[PDB]
Amino acid sequence: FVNQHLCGSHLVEALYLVCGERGFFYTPKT
């Protein structure tokens, strides 16, 4: 699922799945 273009909710979803119990930060304007 990760080696593709991932935008918007799709990217958030990938972060969620990969990062698991760590959580993550989503800072699109960087």
Added chain:
Amino acid sequence: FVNQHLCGSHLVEALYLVCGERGFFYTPKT
């Protein structure tokens, strides 16, 4: 969509929609 129990991907999705271009942080172990 926000005034309910929101868990896992559902919570991430709500953050994404509410926070918009700001982005967000998801730090479940807090």
Added chain:
Amino acid sequence: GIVEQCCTSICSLYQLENYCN
């Protein structure tokens, strides 16, 4: 944290926005 406030209990806009950057 957010899970306690929004998953285990009923979320709010007020709470969600605290986690926006």
Added chain:
Amino acid sequence: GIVEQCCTSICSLYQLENYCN
């Protein structure tokens, strides 16, 4: 940032994990 690396270009695990806490 992440959008440049994963949305506008092809993402990687390596890049994604940089945004985990």
